[PDB]
Symmetry: D2
Subunit: 304 residues, 4 copies
């Protein structure tokens, strides 16, 4: 498999490329940047190759700054952007416009924030099928919520299944109705009352801003999440993950929006959107999140 | 960690010892048999050591036929017996009686059938704490039910959590109320109606007899299951697994019986018994299974 | 990839199939036996599927008793035979004769003893390329010799590279000239004088007889070795292993014989035979072993 | 085990900590920086915990800016310094002076360049045993040289054993006399003549400058190397690696210097220094490198 990383000079692009070459299913990683940063990509290329030697893993690292260098990749990772919607939306247009004409079987993974809005932009400008364009969305938010619950019940992480749907932002929605420990609904689990869901969600929603103001931004957490998504797709693992995808009325008839939703992912991208049944309160928060994401998408498309 | 395998000359003992030495957490495996089969254990010792060399793994393989050779082990696996209750119950008495006096921190894993009944016998004769004596029970039955459901929904196996409680036999009880795919109750999952639970359970309950009449008995399936249980305990993984354990009124006030139940397992054995809430029908089948196991336990203890 | 195991009903066939289905690169394992053992193979199929469920791994297990069931396999493992040369030579002819006509891209690995002689038989009757027919040979013997050396120097096993070439029998030849620890020739390694080469070779060459008279035969060591060889080929790993291969004058001009030699192995079978340079004594032992293997092969071919 | 990283705010400290927490043998990672960078370390702690959640791995991440926060660690990694010898020598003294008084069983790995010189400084100021203070040295340089050789012969990387001893700089010395492929001396290996040793050494020694002028510095290669060394020590793997260690006359009677040499590494640090035998030319280059490292170390000690 060949994976291109656009924005490899950045904090997220460099880290994600380094850990992506360690995957056995990734035979080639192509580093893409603007023409004025190709020299920087040469240094990163040797750095990554040195790390592969240390790990006794193999991968071909290439560099490019043109459309022909990454359009034929199996998976294209979009990590380039300013760390709002207006500026990053143009960058998506520059790189992904018309990709379907050349490689109609491409899969695009969008990391640039706003991830939900820019997934819609990428799908529209690219012309690819709706199942082949996705974004990281709330995947990492769901994973960290999973750890918090597991520690509360003092169980192995694999025992906890949970999810955060909606926008990768303040309008995210934890789905308690579909949270389980060992298959047991968490509501019926002893000790659930002592778990402060509201406090835990606040940790999830605010950790992004705290990391930015102190460290500068997320590099390792997001890069590992991208590794999870790419490995799942390229190995056709068919896991139900929470990614930003185009809704076409599978959940409450809500359609024409890209937002974090449960999706069974494989080599063909989004095989299907799981039609989860939400409770009253969860549905109300989900609808509020969808309305917020749709208005932002309106602004982005106008800027394009 | 040191693990002793009593009955290493048999189909289950030999296979389980071979795969147990491959675990990184298993530094020594002691092969225990009757004095008239020590010579056979010498051949098996070199065979296993040859396999470790092929796998580039390390482990010390010892042999013994006396109490002093295995009483100080961290985990003792009881695979010796005829492949009913009366004959195998005496064998449990011979090897495990009084083990608490010498090593009170021992953990006993019982595989000899009837596993549920013989777990009670082993706990009584050994004098160990009720949390340090367990049996394989319905762990493998739950794992195979897990695979059948995963293939039905065409999802990764890790997405499916399910369980079979009760006797390792005809009175086993699948717990649909605590079965989930991605955290979603399977009842709310689209396509659940097309899954034939009754047919699938019949496959689980009868595969044992079909294997016996054709191949002779289970060797690889059960041996791998034992590897799962021992790895979980020695690495303190704290997974919720289905093993035969002593109930003391955690489920519906049913007490004084050993039967397959959900249990969080760690280095200390059964940390706790998950107090699952069952539905009407599931509770009725569970009570029928408990009554059957209790009568069999009555016969066994009398024989001792 | 699909791997067929002829003789799956046996000790070596059953065990090798069980561990081969655990490899991620093996998607299907076909169990082949004589027609009067199909029912036994049904039980072995259910047992192995139980182990896969316990290990959370996936593979399709098929059953067959006809040529059409295994001729299209990528790798065919020959474990069927009496546990000599005359009787087993006929068995090889029955199964492998003309295989090139149907699947010319097949790879045959021969385990039935005499392994070197029957590797020659399989190549002749099959009509396959000389690089697509090999045998286990001295791979496991070299592996155990490697462990003994590593323990002597108290170093990690990966640090020791060594090999035993020639017949898988009494005429095997350890190659000290090409034995190294960390890249340092073992002769120059401190403590090499305290290593009793004669004692170590005695343990390796006789362990087969010791195991047979007590346990019955080699089961786990050989099964793991088959897993090693098949994984190496199917993943095109290009490791230098000691397998029985057809010599065409790469070592001292010796040709027209199958015997254990260093060979770089990949998806195309034997990519090349390493032209090792032997010392005087080592070469004389190699010629003695070749003489024994050639005479035995002549007798086998006469039996047809 | 607990591993402390001094300089976690830097490119090497942050990256090394992120990959060190992924090791199963590392239960705690402590991030150490100057007091004015504690807030930045808080963000790095949250980011790394996010990566652990994504990777389904567990580890406790702590923060500190005082000696008491890291003196009781099992392994202390020194990545703090200006990216020469005079300024960095003071930094080493501040952190490691007197560490033996509090935790005499600590192991110090020095990464700050000049690595060889500062390894000597750390050993002197700490008062620790000569076997408990080491440096990264030429481990990564040897690893990349190993990959280049493997690609030339088109063999698996595990088949190549090689090392570069001496200074981690322009006076490094490749040891062809102790380079082997599959146990065969590389000089006797077919195709060795087509290998341009001078070209390969040029790539290894200069890649550091090439990376610095474009990317800024080494980040991923060195971070992975630290993970390699720490895992080797904490799991008592007994691998022969090339690290900066105190020579006491094991190689040509050269003593009173820290420089890259083959060393068998375990939980006790440097178990022993392999007394490699060098050829005429290789030994002369080794003496030249020792002369350079000794003069630089003299200058450093004067700076205190
Ligand atoms: N999923 C999440 O929650 C997270 C998402 N992100 C998103 O990733 C994006 C960048 O993150 P980060 O990499 O940390 O920011 P950086 O500034 O560190 O990296 C910026 C990248 O974008 C490229 N770039 C900037 N402007 C342009 C342009 N006009 N045309 C083409 N390429 C351009 C840069 O190339 P050059 O080297 O030439 O500048 C560089 O590769 C942001 O949108 C951020 O929100 C990041 C972290 C967390
Ligand atoms: N969990 C499950 O569902 C399964 C459980 N099992 C149970 O495992 C047990 C044996 O399985 P298997 O190993 O296939 O049967 P085998 O007969 O193949 O192995 C029998 C073992 O028991 C030992 N043994 C027999 N009689 C005595 C005795 N009187 N005193 C001491 N040791 C004795 C044998 O030693 P010697 O070599 O001297 O005979 C041998 O080690 C049975 O109880 C069977 O039900 C097995 C498969 C599946
Ligand atoms: N290092 C090595 O290379 C080693 C190789 N081996 C070899 O492995 C082979 C099998 O060992 P093992 O499996 O223990 O012996 P088993 O008798 O236990 O297994 C015999 C297998 O051969 C099959 N078989 C027997 N006779 C015939 C026949 N006439 N035609 C076709 N198939 C037949 C049987 O099938 P059914 O049940 O239908 O008869 C069964 O699957 C032996 O040749 C042995 O030498 C073993 C150890 C070391
Ligand atoms: N193969 C090898 O051995 C290699 C080693 N290295 C070495 O790694 C070291 C760091 O490289 P890098 O991390 O990229 O450089 P950075 O400047 O990116 O990181 C510098 C680190 O040093 C700390 N630091 C700087 N000045 C002082 C001081 N006066 N007292 C205490 N701590 C201080 C900083 O902490 P703060 O943010 O608080 O200042 C920061 O954590 C360098 O010495 C470099 O030579 C690098 C490449 C190869
Ligand atoms: Cl998710
Ligand atoms: Cl279970
Ligand atoms: Cl096995
Ligand atoms: Cl080999
Ligand atoms: Cl990283
Ligand atoms: Cl090294
Ligand atoms: K790779
Ligand atoms: K082990
Ligand atoms: K498989
Ligand atoms: K860890």
């Amino acid at each position: 498999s060949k994976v291109a990383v656009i924005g490899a000079t950045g904090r997220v692009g460099s880290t994600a490329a380094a850990r992506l070459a360690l995957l056995d299913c990734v035979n080639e990683v192509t580093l893409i940047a603007r023409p004025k940063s190709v020299d920087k990509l040469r240094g990163l290329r040797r750095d990554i190759l040195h790390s592969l030697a240390a790990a006794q893993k193999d991968a071909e690292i290439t560099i490019g700054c043109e459309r022909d260098d990454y359009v034929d990749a199996d998976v294209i990772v979009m990590t380039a952007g300013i760390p709002l919607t207006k500026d990053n939306a143009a960058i998506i247009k520059k790189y992904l416009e018309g990709v379907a004409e050349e490689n109609p079987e491409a899969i695009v993974l969008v990391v640039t924030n706003p991830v939900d809005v820019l997934t819609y932009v990428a799908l529209k400008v690219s012309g690819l099928p709706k199942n082949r364009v996705i974004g990281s969305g709330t995947h990492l938010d769901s994973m960290r919520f999973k750890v918090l619950i597991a520690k509360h019940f003092n169980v192995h992480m694999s025992e906890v299944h949970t999810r955060i749907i909606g926008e990768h932002g303040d309008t995210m929605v934890p789905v308690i109705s579909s949270t389980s420990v060992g298959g047991i609904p968490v509501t019926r689990m002893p000790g659930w009352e002592d778990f402060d869901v509201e406090e835990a969600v606040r940790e999830v929603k605010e950790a992004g801003q705290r990391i930015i103001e102190t460290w500068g931004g997320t590099q390792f957490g997001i890069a590992q999440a991208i590794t999870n998504l790419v490995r799942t797709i390229l190995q056709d693992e068919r896991r139900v993950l929470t990614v930003s995808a185009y809704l076409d009325g599978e959940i409450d008839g809500i359609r024409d929006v890209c937002i974090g939703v449960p999706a069974r992912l494989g080599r063909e991208g989004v095989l299907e959107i799981v039609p989860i049944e939400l409770e009253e309160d969860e549905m109300r928060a989900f609808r509020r999140s969808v309305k917020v994401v749709k208005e932002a998408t309106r602004e982005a498309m106008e800027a394009i």
